[PDB]
Amino acid sequence: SDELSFTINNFVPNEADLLFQGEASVSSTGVLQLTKVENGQPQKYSVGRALYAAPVRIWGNTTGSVASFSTSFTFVVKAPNPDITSDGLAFYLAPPDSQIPSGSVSKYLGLFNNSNSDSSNQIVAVEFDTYFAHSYDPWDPNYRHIGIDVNGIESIKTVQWDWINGGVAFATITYLAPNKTLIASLVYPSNQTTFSVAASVDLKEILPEWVRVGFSAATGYPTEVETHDVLSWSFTSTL
Amino acid sequence: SDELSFTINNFVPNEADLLFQGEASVSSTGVLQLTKVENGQPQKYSVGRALYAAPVRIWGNTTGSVASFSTSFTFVVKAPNPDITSDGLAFYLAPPDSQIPSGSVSKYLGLFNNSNSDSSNQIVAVEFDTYFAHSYDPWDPNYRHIGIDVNGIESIKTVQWDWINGGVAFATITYLAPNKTLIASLVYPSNQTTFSVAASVDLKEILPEWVRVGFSAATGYPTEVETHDVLSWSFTSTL
Numbered sequence: 001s002d003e004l005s006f007t008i009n010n011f012v013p014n015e016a017d018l019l020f021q022g023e024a025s026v027s028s029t030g031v032l033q034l035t036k037v038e039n040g041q042p043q044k045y046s047v048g049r050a051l052y053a054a055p056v057r058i059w060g061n062t063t064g065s066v067a068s069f070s071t072s073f074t075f076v077v078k079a080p081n082p083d084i085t086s087d088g089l090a091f092y093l094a095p096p097d098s099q100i101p102s103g104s105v106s107k108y109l110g111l112f113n114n115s116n117s118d119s120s121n122q123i124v125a126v127e128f129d130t131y132f133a134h135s136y137d138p139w140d141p142n143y144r145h146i147g148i149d150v151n152g153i154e155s156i157k158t159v160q161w162d163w164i165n166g167g168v169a170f171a172t173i174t175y176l177a178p179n180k181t182l183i184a185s186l187v188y189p190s191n192q193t194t195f196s197v198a199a200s201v202d203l204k205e206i207l208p209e210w211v212r213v214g215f216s217a218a219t220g221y222p223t224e225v226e227t228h229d230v231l232s233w234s235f236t237s238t239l
Numbered sequence: 240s241d242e243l244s245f246t247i248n249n250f251v252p253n254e255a256d257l258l259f260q261g262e263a264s265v266s267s268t269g270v271l272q273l274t275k276v277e278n279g280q281p282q283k284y285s286v287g288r289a290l291y292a293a294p295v296r297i298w299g300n301t302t303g304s305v306a307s308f309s310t311s312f313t314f315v316v317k318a319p320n321p322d323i324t325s326d327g328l329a330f331y332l333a334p335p336d337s338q339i340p341s342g343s344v345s346k347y348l349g350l351f352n353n354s355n356s357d358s359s360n361q362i363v364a365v366e367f368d369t370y371f372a373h374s375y376d377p378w379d380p381n382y383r384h385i386g387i388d389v390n391g392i393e394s395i396k397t398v399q400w401d402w403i404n405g406g407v408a409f410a411t412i413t414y415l416a417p418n419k420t421l422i423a424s425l426v427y428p429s430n431q432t433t434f435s436v437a438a439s440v441d442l443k444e445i446l447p448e449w450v451r452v453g454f455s456a457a458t459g460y461p462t463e464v465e466t467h468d469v470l471s472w473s474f475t476s477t478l
């Protein structure tokens with residue numbers, strides 16, 4: 001594909017154009033629930049991933065060009081016990097066939113097996129990290145944050161994010177190919193607060209020609225559970 | 240129009256789909272020069288405005304709906320004397336036939352006659368203010384800033400903007416109709432710095448059904464002159 005664009009205003013149960021991994025799924029009410037919820041209550045140690053069914057062409061060696069893209073989606077992270085929550089969700093690009101790694105992966109938002117930034121992971125992600133205690137996440141700044149990750153959970157760049165328990169967030173992620181710059185942005189219309197981050201990233205150097213795009217999220221200790229619900233999602237890429 | 244979308248990757252001299260006001264124009268090199276430049280040096284007390292030729296439908300009383308839009312553009316503000324510059328540029332929406340007001344309008348970025356927030360102005364703008372001394376701009380915060388204006392030069396909301404003399408900026412402005420939220424964002428791929436702001440705005444309440452969209456900029460005292468050049472511009476609105 002040289003141009004791919006899709007808009008999902010309302011998710012549908014077992015949505016055909018979505019590849020589900022782990023405990024992810026969309027509720028009868030139309031929300032993409034990354035982590036498991038029962039009776040409206042988020043469940044402990046849940047890991048989920050949803051990907052758009054069609055692989056996306058990120059670059060062409062025959063062409064020499066690289067894709068520029070932009071994604072926007074709305075989500076809610078509602079926790080019964082706000083004080084300390086875990087772990088957060090993230091939008092990411094990975095190889096078409098990636099699976100959730102085996103092992104302790106909650107503090108890695110379901111994207112990694114460990115802290116390392118292994119070049120083989122081939123993963124570019126934008127995380128919305130809700131857990132930052134150094135006892136379990138020693139690589140995190142001391143506050144909830146939005147970070148840009150490249151082959152590793154230790155964000156190459158972050159910004160402080162003032163999460164609103166149950167607040168509806170509108171986030172857009174944009175990649176300017178010509179400028180190898182990935183920028184992330186989040187807004188809470190309810191508080192009129194904004195957050196943003198940018199980092200240099202050369203997709204040609206990190207990701208393969210084809211990749212699948214989507215979301216990943218994880219839940220940890222029971223007293224810190226929160227939801228990772230996505231309500232809308234639009235994606236556009238142009239090669 | 241129920242949907243309008245245009246992308247201008249390169250401006251052309253006397254570009255037919257652009258309405259020029261004041262000293263605005265596009266150079267032979269293809270840059271939209273809001274304020275006049277001669278021999279590559281910005282001139283004092285210059286005021287310019289450029290608008291897309293076609294008026295945009297912002298809302299429909301017969302339909303009940305309101306337009307959601309998003310604009311992205313790249314610009315450069317190069318000043319020979321960085322220390323203190325004036326005045327800045329801005330993207331704005333106004334009535335189809337608005338003209339540059341008469342009088343001292345440089346500290347108002349070519350958008351207003353005075354400080355007042357007169358409901359009759361019908362102007363929603365996002366300013367990139369480079370001059371903030373309280374002696375002439377008593378309404379400004381104490382730093383260069385990006386602010387959201389509504390019928391007046393005194394921004395209803397701002398954020399600190401760390402201008403880069405001659406740096407190429409990529410800015411996007413988005414209006415979420417359903418949430419009456421106008422958000423502004425700027426990034427300098429060269430420093431990987433980001434800035435963003437959001438504010439509650441009800442276009443139905445401020446602007447008329449039809450409006451023209453574009454840019455405004457002004458230059459002041461000779462020792463503080465700077466350029467207000469726009470390189471790219473894409474606009475999309477959907478009713």
Ligand SMILES: CC(=O)N[C@H]1[C@H]([C@H](O)[C@H](O)CO)O[C@@](O[C@H]2[C@@H](O)[C@@H](CO)O[C@@H](O[C@H]3[C@H](O)[C@@H](O)[C@H](O)O[C@@H]3CO)[C@@H]2O)(C(=O)O)C[C@@H]1O
Binds near residue numbers: 108136137221224
């Ligand atoms: C094999 C296995 O099941 N590993 C778990 C780990 C283990 O708890 C860990 O290996 C024990 O050393 O926990 C995992 O989730 C943890 C993760 O969410 C972190 C931070 O993101 O928080 C941990 O919860 C803490 C909690 O924050 C404290 O307040 C509490 O006192 O202790 C809790 C730990 O018991 C989560 O357990 C992990 O990803 O490492 C999930 C693995 O499956």
Ligand SMILES: CC(=O)N[C@H]1[C@H]([C@H](O)[C@H](O)CO)O[C@@](O[C@H]2[C@@H](O)[C@@H](CO)O[C@@H](O[C@H]3[C@H](O)[C@@H](O)[C@H](O)O[C@@H]3CO)[C@@H]2O)(C(=O)O)C[C@@H]1O
Binds near residue numbers: 344346
């Ligand atoms: C009638 C008229 O021509 N008005 C000018 C005004 C006049 O200078 C003002 O009415 C005198 O009180 O200036 C206008 O531009 C000014 C504006 O750009 C402000 C701030 O944005 O800066 C002024 O320059 C200052 C400069 O910053 C100082 O360092 C310097 O010492 O004094 C300068 C003023 O002389 C600009 O003049 C204006 O918008 O008010 C342009 C009007 O056309």
Ligand SMILES: *[C@@H]1O[C@H](CO)[C@@H](O)[C@H](O)[C@H]1NC(C)=O
Binds near residue numbers: 062
């Ligand atoms: C392009 O890349 C594909 C796989 O990455 C390879 O099989 C093909 O031979 C390459 N062709 C060129 C011209 O690089």
Ligand SMILES: *[C@@H]1O[C@H](CO)[C@@H](O)[C@H](O)[C@H]1NC(C)=O
Binds near residue numbers: 101102103104113114
């Ligand atoms: C990552 O997955 C591999 C499977 O090849 C497994 O051997 C390894 O234990 C996992 N990493 C961790 C930290 O468990």
Ligand SMILES: *[C@@H]1O[C@H](CO)[C@@H](O)[C@H](O)[C@H]1NC(C)=O
Binds near residue numbers: 074168170190417418
């Ligand atoms: C925007 O408004 C709609 C309808 O009023 C609401 O359902 C939605 O959650 C809001 N979105 C955001 C990001 O606040």
Ligand SMILES: *[C@@H]1O[C@H](CO)[C@@H](O)[C@H](O)[C@H]1NC(C)=O
Binds near residue numbers: 339340341342352
């Ligand atoms: C500019 O302000 C003056 C008063 O200072 C006013 O008389 C004039 O009408 C305004 N300009 C325009 C175009 O209305």
Ligand SMILES: *[C@@H]1O[C@H](CO)[C@@H](O)[C@H](O)[C@H]1NC(C)=O
Binds near residue numbers: 407408409
């Ligand atoms: C992005 O890269 C292009 C090509 O190198 C350049 O012309 C443009 O000014 C850059 N934009 C930004 C915001 O740096």
Ligand SMILES: [Ca+2]
Binds near residue numbers: 087129132137140
């Ligand atoms: Ca964390």
Ligand SMILES: [Ca+2]
Binds near residue numbers: 326370371376379
């Ligand atoms: Ca000012």
Ligand SMILES: [Mn+2]
Binds near residue numbers: 141145147153155
């Ligand atoms: Mn983190």
Ligand SMILES: [Mn+2]
Binds near residue numbers: 394
């Ligand atoms: Mn200002």
